[PDB]
Amino acid sequence: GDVEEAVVHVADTMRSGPSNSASVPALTAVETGHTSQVTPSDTMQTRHVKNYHSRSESTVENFLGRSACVYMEEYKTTDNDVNKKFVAWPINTKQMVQMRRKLEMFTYLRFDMEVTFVITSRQDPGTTLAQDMPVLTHQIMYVPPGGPIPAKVDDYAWQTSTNPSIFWTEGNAPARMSIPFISIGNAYSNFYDGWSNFDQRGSYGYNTLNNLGHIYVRHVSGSSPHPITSTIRVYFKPKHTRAWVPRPPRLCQYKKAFSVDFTPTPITDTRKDINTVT
Amino acid sequence: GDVEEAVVHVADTMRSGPSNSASVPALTAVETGHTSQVTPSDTMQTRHVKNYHSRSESTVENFLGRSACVYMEEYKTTDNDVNKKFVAWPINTKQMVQMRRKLEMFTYLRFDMEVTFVITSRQDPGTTLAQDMPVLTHQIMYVPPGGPIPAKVDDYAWQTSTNPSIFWTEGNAPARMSIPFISIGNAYSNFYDGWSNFDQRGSYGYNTLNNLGHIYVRHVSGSSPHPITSTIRVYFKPKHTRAWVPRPPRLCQYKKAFSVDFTPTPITDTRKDINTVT
Amino acid sequence: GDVEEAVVHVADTMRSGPSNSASVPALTAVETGHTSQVTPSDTMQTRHVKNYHSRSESTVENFLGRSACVYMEEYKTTDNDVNKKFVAWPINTKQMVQMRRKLEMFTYLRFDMEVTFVITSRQDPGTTLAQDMPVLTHQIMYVPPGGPIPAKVDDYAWQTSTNPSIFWTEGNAPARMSIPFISIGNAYSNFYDGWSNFDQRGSYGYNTLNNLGHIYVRHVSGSSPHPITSTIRVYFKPKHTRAWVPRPPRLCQYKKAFSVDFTPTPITDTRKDINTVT
Amino acid sequence: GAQVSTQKTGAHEIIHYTNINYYKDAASNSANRQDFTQDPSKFTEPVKDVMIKSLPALN
Amino acid sequence: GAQVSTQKTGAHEIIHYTNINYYKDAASNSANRQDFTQDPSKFTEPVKDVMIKSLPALN
Amino acid sequence: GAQVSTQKTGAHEIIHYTNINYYKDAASNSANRQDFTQDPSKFTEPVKDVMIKSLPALN
Amino acid sequence: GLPTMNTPGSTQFLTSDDFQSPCALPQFDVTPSMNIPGEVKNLMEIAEVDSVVPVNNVQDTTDQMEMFRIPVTINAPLQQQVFGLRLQPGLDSVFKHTLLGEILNYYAHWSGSMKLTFVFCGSAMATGKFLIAYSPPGANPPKTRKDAMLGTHIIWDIGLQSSCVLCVPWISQTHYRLVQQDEYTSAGYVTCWYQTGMIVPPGTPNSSSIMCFASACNDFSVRMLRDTPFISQDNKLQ
Amino acid sequence: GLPTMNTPGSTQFLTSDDFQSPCALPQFDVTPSMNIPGEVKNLMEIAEVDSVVPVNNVQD
Amino acid sequence: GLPTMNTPGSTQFLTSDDFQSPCALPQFDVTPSMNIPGEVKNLMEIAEVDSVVPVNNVQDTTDQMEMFRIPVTINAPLQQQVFGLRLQPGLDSVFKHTLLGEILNYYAHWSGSMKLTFVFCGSAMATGKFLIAYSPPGANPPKTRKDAMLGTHIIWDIGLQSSCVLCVPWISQTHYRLVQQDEYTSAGYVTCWYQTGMIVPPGTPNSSSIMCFASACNDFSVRMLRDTPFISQDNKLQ
Amino acid sequence: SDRVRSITLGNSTITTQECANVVVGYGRWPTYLRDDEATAEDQPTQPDVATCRFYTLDSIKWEKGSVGWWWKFPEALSDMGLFGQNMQYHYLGRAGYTIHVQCNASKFHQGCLLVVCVPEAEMGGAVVGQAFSATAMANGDKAYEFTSATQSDQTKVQTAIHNAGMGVGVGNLTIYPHQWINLRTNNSATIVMPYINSVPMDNMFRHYNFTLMVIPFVKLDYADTASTYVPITVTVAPMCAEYNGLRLAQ
Numbered sequence A, B, C: 001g002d003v004e005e006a007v008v009h010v011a012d013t014m015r016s017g018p019s020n021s022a023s024v025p026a027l028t029a030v031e032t033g034h035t036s037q038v039t040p041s042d043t044m045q046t047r048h049v050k051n052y053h054s055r056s057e058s059t060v061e062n063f064l065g066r067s068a069c070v071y072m073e074e075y076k077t078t079d080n081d082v083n084k085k086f087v088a089w090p091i092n093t094k095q096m097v098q099m100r101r102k103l104e105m106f107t108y109l110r111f112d113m114e115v116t117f118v119i120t121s122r123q124d125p126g127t128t129l130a131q132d133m134p135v136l137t138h139q140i141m142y143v144p145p146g147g148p149i150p151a152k153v154d155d156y157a158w159q160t161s162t163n164p165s166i167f168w169t170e171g172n173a174p175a176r177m178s179i180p181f182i183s184i185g186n187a188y189s190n191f192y193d194g195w196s197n198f199d200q201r202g203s204y205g206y207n208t209l210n211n212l213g214h215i216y217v218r219h220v221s222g223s224s225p226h227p228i229t230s231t232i233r234v235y236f237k238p239k240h241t242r243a244w245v246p247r248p249p250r251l252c253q254y255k256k257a258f259s260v261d262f263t264p265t266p267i268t269d270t271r272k273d274i275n276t277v278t
Numbered sequence D, E, F: 001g002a003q004v005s006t007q008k009t010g011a012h013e014i015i016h017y018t019n020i021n022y023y024k025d026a027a028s029n030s031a032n033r034q035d036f037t038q039d040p041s042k043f044t045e046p047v048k049d050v051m052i053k054s055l056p057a058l059n
Numbered sequence G, I: 001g002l003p004t005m006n007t008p009g010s011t012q013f014l015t016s017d018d019f020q021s022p023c024a025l026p027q028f029d030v031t032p033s034m035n036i037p038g039e040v041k042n043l044m045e046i047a048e049v050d051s052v053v054p055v056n057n058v059q060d061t062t063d064q065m066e067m068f069r070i071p072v073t074i075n076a077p078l079q080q081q082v083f084g085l086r087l088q089p090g091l092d093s094v095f096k097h098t099l100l101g102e103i104l105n106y107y108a109h110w111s112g113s114m115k116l117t118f119v120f121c122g123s124a125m126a127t128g129k130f131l132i133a134y135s136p137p138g139a140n141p142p143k144t145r146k147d148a149m150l151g152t153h154i155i156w157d158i159g160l161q162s163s164c165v166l167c168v169p170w171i172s173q174t175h176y177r178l179v180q181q182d183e184y185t186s187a188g189y190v191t192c193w194y195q196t197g198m199i200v201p202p203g204t205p206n207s208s209s210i211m212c213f214a215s216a217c218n219d220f221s222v223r224m225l226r227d228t229p230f231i232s233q234d235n236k237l238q
Numbered sequence H: 001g002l003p004t005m006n007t008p009g010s011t012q013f014l015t016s017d018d019f020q021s022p023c024a025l026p027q028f029d030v031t032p033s034m035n036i037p038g039e040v041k042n043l044m045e046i047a048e049v050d051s052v053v054p055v056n057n058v059q060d
Numbered sequence J: 001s002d003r004v005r006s007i008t009l010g011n012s013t014i015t016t017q018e019c020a021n022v023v024v025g026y027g028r029w030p031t032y033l034r035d036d037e038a039t040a041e042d043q044p045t046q047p048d049v050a051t052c053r054f055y056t057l058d059s060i061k062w063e064k065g066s067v068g069w070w071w072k073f074p075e076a077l078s079d080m081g082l083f084g085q086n087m088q089y090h091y092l093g094r095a096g097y098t099i100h101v102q103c104n105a106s107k108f109h110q111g112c113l114l115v116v117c118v119p120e121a122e123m124g125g126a127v128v129g130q131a132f133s134a135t136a137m138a139n140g141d142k143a144y145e146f147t148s149a150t151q152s153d154q155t156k157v158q159t160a161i162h163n164a165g166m167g168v169g170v171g172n173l174t175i176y177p178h179q180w181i182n183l184r185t186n187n188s189a190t191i192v193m194p195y196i197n198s199v200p201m202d203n204m205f206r207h208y209n210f211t212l213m214v215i216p217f218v219k220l221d222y223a224d225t226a227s228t229y230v231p232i233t234v235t236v237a238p239m240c241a242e243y244n245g246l247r248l249a250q
Ligand SMILES: CN1CCN(Cc2ccc(NCc3ccc(C(F)(F)F)cc3)cc2)CC1
Pocket: A091, A092, A093, A094, A113, A115, A140, A141, A142, A143, A164, A165, A177, A178, A179, A182, A188, A189, A190, A210, A212, A215, G024
């Protein structure tokens, strides 16, 4: 045998007739912290309905199984400022609001990651644009914490012998790659109500547990007679996801990339009066 | 077993000889709404003919199983007008006459969809054309109803975390993708003889049931020193089709994209007289 | 049957209680050259712990199974100096410090090799840059020891009939290739404490055993009206590795590509005193 | 998990092809344009009482 | 070493696909979005003593 | 001529992959990084006479 | 080698694709798994939990917490309206930011029945009866208790049990409804009226409050994942 | 990997082709089917229905 | 030919990939293998070997070899400290360049227990006792022997057996620790104190020395291969 | 009758004649760490009846204008009985908790309180982009008060009640384990919280496992009575506590 052969619809509605008895499903007590389990069949007459709807699209795997941008930055092929010819980004998921809010609906997460890179280039404006340049090439370097960090585009650190790297040429498909679960703990933590030092001092919040490393990007050897600007976008796509301890979605707009600071916001919008329905 | 092994010719003609009897297949009565089922064998002598013709190419699946353009629009990489640098199209199948008429031969349809995108670019004329630009990249965004809509090319909404998107680079094959049956009802409706409000007021016609969403397109980061214009064409190809309640093909030329309005037209062309045959 | 169906966690911790006996695991004698095999269970009370950690990532195969750059050089498509239009590199692994140190942790190695070439081109600056050139092509030639060596870009030696070669066009994926174990001895030698002549004279050190050949690169026929510069990077990735006789990692910075010469260096950094811990 | 089925050909003149599905959604499958069943009765004979061609339509 | 499993489709309207793994790391596999098990009790009925809907909540 | 073997995964949380060789030279095969045997005795216990941890090292 | 032809869609990046890709940390040993309490495997489980509904959006709430309380008085004109609202869980301001509306705002289609639970937070000696009715879609919302009582409704009696539930059945012409509801997919109205009135003995407050809880039944479901419009940014966070 | 060679016709868009493509709404639950009266499976069924012929085209 | 579609990542060069490639020397006959003594199949085997630790980094060592010796004297004030150090095998200067720290510097995560072996290199007639204690992470390191003795410790008696071992157990809140240790992943301190003092007979030197050896236990492990920062170059070697 | 409950831990007992059911965390009862999930090697201490017993924190007053209060654990119990000493002398700790809140009033009073345990209740500062010390959110057993208006002082946390100092809707806290104290039918709330964290054990002085919040959704009200306020008392009892890593105290 060279093959191995490896769906749950929502509940149906049962027919109910007139009733007159001492049983009172309608009345309950919310003080117990218990959500009532009543159904429409328990408070009115209903017909028999066979329901084929399924909750497949509501699973956490599908909810978080979408690629979302997490960072973009620009770097020039040639310029006077050395720091402006390459990028250096500390990895974190708090930079972009949509994905930040999507992830922040759970306290702990455990998943594999799929990373895709989209790179585009454009020629900067100027008084003289006539030139001929072959196709450009780009290098993406990942430096785990504690490793050497390059200080310039042509630094020796770009000779990766252990640090994984990807070389990509313009005109082909976007680069893609997979990352396993690389947390020292048993699960990622979106929130951390604690301090760094044992005497309750120092850094506070989720900034203390962010030690994922850095990412560096540069033009391999391209150096045009005239400046050329390139942009890189990073996309994250969790796989094989598991979540714990859901929490209410955020209401106030984000204001800091490494803090929960916010400004007070109204609960919701208003209307003319309690009876207005138009 | 790692394999699973998974044609109807038209009717033949039977030999018929001289007849003289009280049976009269020729005479009938159209007042019953019944189409006569007579055959040439019933009104004249015929030979035996074995017929191998088949109606395979006349099936609805094959008739509607052809990709047809449904929309084109132009957008510039750089310009003063913000609205002119990206496209925003509400999805509908009434824009182009050929596909509109092909679909409008049936009242209700149920099918999967296959969408293909063809994108081309050209450099706008000007007094100075000398420039060098790398290959361009394009993003296609689909926004289901009620989602946020970008207001400019570099808006935050372009960071899709849940909205599906496609990134495409010029020079490769056209983008392709599949869509399932996404109607709230049990089948699509080409016609709707009704109103929107319960008091018979408001919008009238098939415009009321069009809530499929929007599609947005932009240049990812391309911004040339000189303007460049790009055009996108959208092609729809129904799959796994089913149809109900056929209706006569349209006769008058279309005049509105969201209405049945028309101008009276002659039934057909004329000839010299009822006997002219030359 | 057309198929053939083809993990070692670290040691666990056993529960230990109070003890009082003549057995003394703690005391030993390092004078024997023997490293003590004691465990925390032998000197304190411990709970039972099931440990699932594995040493998979610490194997030599994975440690050395990473591609690392070993050489880069530049050559121009057109120039007055003949020697500047092509490259000629004697193969050796001592050029780049990271890979040199990684390899030098063992005395003898035996592995297959996987070679990847990354080539990029750029247009040299000048007063007139306007030109149109088709895509360039490059040739990589490998000459085992004793073979003919080209003296110019258009030499007859470039007509390889036995010497393996690779022709590569810009815009495609980087060239890749495999090399078996090609040492005359039973294993590569990173160090050689000996001389070349039998009377203890001549060359000294690992330079005597380096006879791997040369590599040559050129533009096939590209000759632009204006100069164009190209750079090539060579990456080595050992496969199926075996190592013997480990030796301490180097401490002093490298100073020569074919010698062990060095400058004395302090053992390590200093601190205020023997008790300082802050 | 490979399907083998015949391919369209002539009347009397290895006429097999193999298909495999790579995606987990049925909407990704190729068009099933090999069905040739049809029944014109619903539109040609919508009457209640069956009428015989040989006998008179009325009386 | 090929897995065959059903693909998502309608309710009452060859619904099989084949998958093979090419890489030695489980992290390289495709998303396992075919699981549909769920249990809301942990959040809807966190009480110690079971309560019957028909009987009064208290006494 | 296809090999089926397990792929790296967790401790207690279809973990199979298929491999086929296309070239006639063994040097073209992929890295065999699935071996995890090790023995530190050669470097940690190079003595001639076996020493027991419990008993005194000397006398 | 093996002849092949590329089909349309090659080299494209689709954000919702499922493909295998190489691992850049081969033979990486992941941390052992641990069964943390409170695992969630489906957002519907979250959606089925009750949450307080801010019904009192009177445009003059100087105190935000006042939004959660529905006022009640002792000598009420007979058959008066207590509150009224539109049944648009994903669009109406009342249900917009609730624990349920937040989940629905990530989707485009929804279906199933809903639960509304009301709890009386008055004195123990207070008593009264209330009529809560659900009116399916129509040309006009009810204006009086006589109009309201014609639709689905329940008579609530306040006693030892301080809470009552009102299952809003799923009555619709389509299998699904749009989150961005319109006239075509309207859902109806919900209103509450005095049935007998509130009576209190001497030495008690003359006013009381009621709270409402919203949750989904076991037949609820959603579809078409979309991006929520409640959150936006103008510049990169730092 | 597996050696391969592209044949003529690769990367072309033929409007009458039959190929599989990825789904952009994975695990989407379609509405249950209903048997609406008057299903048509072949245009010939339409073609076999009678229709009035405008024979009197007398140009006046 | 066979229809196909390229997925993202095609034509990319990943330095840690595993793919087959053509051989440029077909039917090449390799030299027969020979079993050279001393084969190594895992860097952990190297990591488990002892190495001398330079504890005496007193910022005034005119002689480099002095770094390896811990001074000791005859009439020591009662309960004095001999040495103290931080337990950061991959970051502290003491363990940075040892045979173990060098291996750890090629990785990012580490876990397991460690062994510290001390050998007395005084006269044969000298005698004494020492207390060696390991203090888990805390807000303050110990300052006195009374503070030190509260944590894990062993009493070392100098006699015929000249060496004693001090297994540092793996006590941590996480399964792994960062090589670039920080406040969050601190590991503690190790200190040594006089227990009884050193006594010598007439005609012997008044001072002695001690040496320390560091190695890993059989439960040690590493993870996340990275590039070491100890070696760098500015120009191509020639 | 199911309206009477009795809880016995160690040498202390709690009796309530007027109470609702008992909520058990996420359906998980507290338990000791298993052998196949532990990471530390040395035997753990299990002070049994000495640390697992009810400890009553200080009482608060409920006025007509109260807005709410919160406590952070185990910093609240950091200096209570032998539990505090064992916390001080150990590096790692682990324990579940049982929370009991008492509030009684006559039949002529009205009001509703929400009792909820929020794990990892990270809070933001009043002045965005300005740090706060570990004194504006935990100073032992004392309770911290929410504020109706927006906080303005930069040295303390944002106390906006309707946002709960976490940037989320106060009405959505129902997702966490919780109970309601309605004066009509209830006088006490009981919650059993298991140990929830991303690691088997953690230091209790550096990390706040969870936060306890009490919010009056319906303000207290009464008329013509001599009682001016309704005291609230909180009692907590660690369960299945075990510690590891003996070091010098502090
Ligand atoms: C705050 N969030 C905590 C969880 N964490 C998950 C996570 C972990 C690792 C990554 N790695 C992305 C990556 C970087 C670099 C490469 C390289 F190109 F170097 F190979 C590959 C993948 C992402 C997310 C997210 C933050």
